[PDB]
C-alpha cells in the first residue's frame, strides 16, 4: 500500500485532487512517484535510453558506477526524463524510473496549419539547451512524423507528439545532454506565451487552500 | 617479415563438407515465413530478451 508523506500526496490519495493538471497549475513539486502512478500509472511506458559506466579513480583501481537514463511518458501529452547513478545497474534503472516519474511535465501540442481534429505537433518553434547541445523543435504538417535523431524521437513519441521537425547542434553524442535538451524543449511548450493564451488568468483555489479542512482534521 | 606462412590457417583447418539441406523459399514466400515467425505466433514473449539466433 501507499502511505503518503506530504500534503500533496495525502490530498491525491484521498481523491481530493482531480487531475495531475491541478498540480501543474500551481507549479507544485511532486516528491512522491505514487502520485504519478495514481494519475497516469495505467498508461505510462518507460524506456532505458542508456546505461553509462562512469568511473572514479581511487587509490586501488577504478570505482565503477552505472548511470541509467530513463524516459517515461504516456503517449498523450506527458513525458519525463530521469537519470540515476548507482552501484548496480538494476538499482540505477529503478531509481531512474522513479526520477523520470517525478519529473513528468505537461506537453502542449498544436497545429501546423489548419486546426481540424486533435493537435498533432508542437505549438511553435521551441528550443532546449543542455551543455552545448541545442535541440530545436519545429511544427510539422500532418502525417510528417518525427524528423529527428533516435533519442529525441523516443522522447517526442513518448510525449504524444505526432509530427515534428528537429534541428540539433553541439555534441549530441552526449546522450544525456541530448535527452535533457529535448526534454527542456518539450517542457518549454507550455511556458511559451501565444496569443491564444493572452486571456486574463482567473485564479482558482489552491489544493492546499481548498482542502485545508481535510488536512487539519486528518 | 617472412612470407612462408601464407595460407597457413586456411590450409591447416579440417575441411568440413556443407551439409545437405532442403532449399529455402524465395521472394514473397520467404517474406511470408519471416512475417509468420516475427509476428503471428510468438509464445516465449514474457518480458525477456530473445534473439532469432540465440544459442542459449
Amino acid at each position: 500500500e501507499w502511505m503518503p508523506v506530504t500534503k500533496l500526496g495525502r490530498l491525491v490519495k484521498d481523491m481530493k485532487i482531480k487531475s495531475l493538471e491541478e498540480i501543474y497549475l500551481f507549479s507544485l513539486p511532486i516528491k512522491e512517484s505514487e502520485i504519478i502512478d495514481f494519475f497516469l500509472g495505467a498508461s505510462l511506458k518507460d524506456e532505458v535510453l542508456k546505461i553509462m559506466p562512469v568511473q572514479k579513480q581511487t587509490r586501488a583501481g577504478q570505482r565503477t558506477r552505472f548511470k541509467a537514463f530513463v524516459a517515461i511518458g504516456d503517449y498523450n501529452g506527458h513525458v519525463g526524463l530521469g537519470v540515476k547513478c548507482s552501484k548496480e545497474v538494476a538499482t540505477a534503472i529503478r531509481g531512474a524510473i522513479i526520477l523520470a516519474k517525478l519529473s513528468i511535465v505537461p506537453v502542449r501540442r498544436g497545429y501546423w496549419g489548419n486546426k481540424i481534429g486533435k493537435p498533432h505537433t508542437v505549438p511553435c518553434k521551441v528550443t532546449g539547451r543542455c551543455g552545448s547541445v541545442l535541440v530545436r523543435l519545429i511544427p510539422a504538417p500532418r502525417g510528417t512524423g518525427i524528423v529527428s535523431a533516435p533519442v529525441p524521437k523516443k522522447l517526442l513519441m513518448m510525449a504524444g507528439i505526432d509530427d515534428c521537425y528537429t534541428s540539433a547542434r553541439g555534441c549530441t553524442a552526449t546522450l544525456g545532454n541530448f535527452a535533457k535538451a529535448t526534454f527542456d524543449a518539450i517542457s518549454k511548450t507550455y511556458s511559451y506565451l501565444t496569443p491564444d493564451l493572452w486571456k486574463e488568468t482567473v485564479f482558482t483555489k489552491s489544493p492546499y487552500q481548498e482542502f485545508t479542512d481535510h488536512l487539519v482534521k486528518t | 617479415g617472412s612470407l612462408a606462412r601464407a595460407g597457413k590457417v586456411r590450409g591447416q583447418t579440417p575441411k568440413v563438407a556443407k551439409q545437405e539441406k532442403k532449399k529455402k523459399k524465395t521472394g514473397r514466400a520467404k517474406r511470408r515465413m519471416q512475417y509468420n515467425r516475427r509476428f503471428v505466433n510468438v509464445v516465449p514473449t514474457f518480458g525477456k530478451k530473445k534473439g532469432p539466433n540465440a544459442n542459449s
Binding site: V48, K50, P53, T64, E88, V89 | K48, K49
Partner: peptide
C-alpha cells in the same frame, strides 16, 4: 529484468563484450 546482462556488465564494465551488454540493456 535481464539480470544476466547486467551482471555480465558489472563483471567487466570496459570488457571486450562491454559494448554488446550495454546495447542489450538499452531499450
Amino acid at each position: 529484468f535481464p539480470y544476466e546482462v547486467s551482471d555480465a556488465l558489472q563483471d567487466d564494465p570496459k570488457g571486450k563484450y562491454s559494448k554488446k551488454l550495454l546495447n542489450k540493456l538499452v531499450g
